[PDB]
């Protein structure tokens, strides 16, 4: 499972608009636990693609 820092870097490196990136990062801080972080990463992939 990717760490919180890796997931943040992925958001930052994506081509999404800045406000979209900022809101995703805000949501990330509310995620708690390895399981939810993994689910976060999965949904994030669908948005990035």
């Amino acid at each position: 499972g990717a760490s919180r820092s890796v997931i943040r870097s992925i958001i930052k490196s994506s081509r999404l608009e800045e406000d979209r990136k900022r809101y995703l990062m805000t949501l990330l801080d509310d995620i708690k636990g390895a399981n939810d972080l993994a689910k976060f990463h999965q949904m994030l992939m669908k948005i990035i693609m």
Binding site: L24, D30, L44
Partner: peptide, 19 residues
């Protein structure tokens, strides 16, 4: 409360992904 907040964040994320 921490888990519920996390669950809600995932729901908000899901809505952005249009899932």
């Amino acid at each position: 409360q921490d888990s519920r907040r996390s669950a809600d964040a995932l729901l908000r994320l899901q809505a952005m992904a249009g899932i």
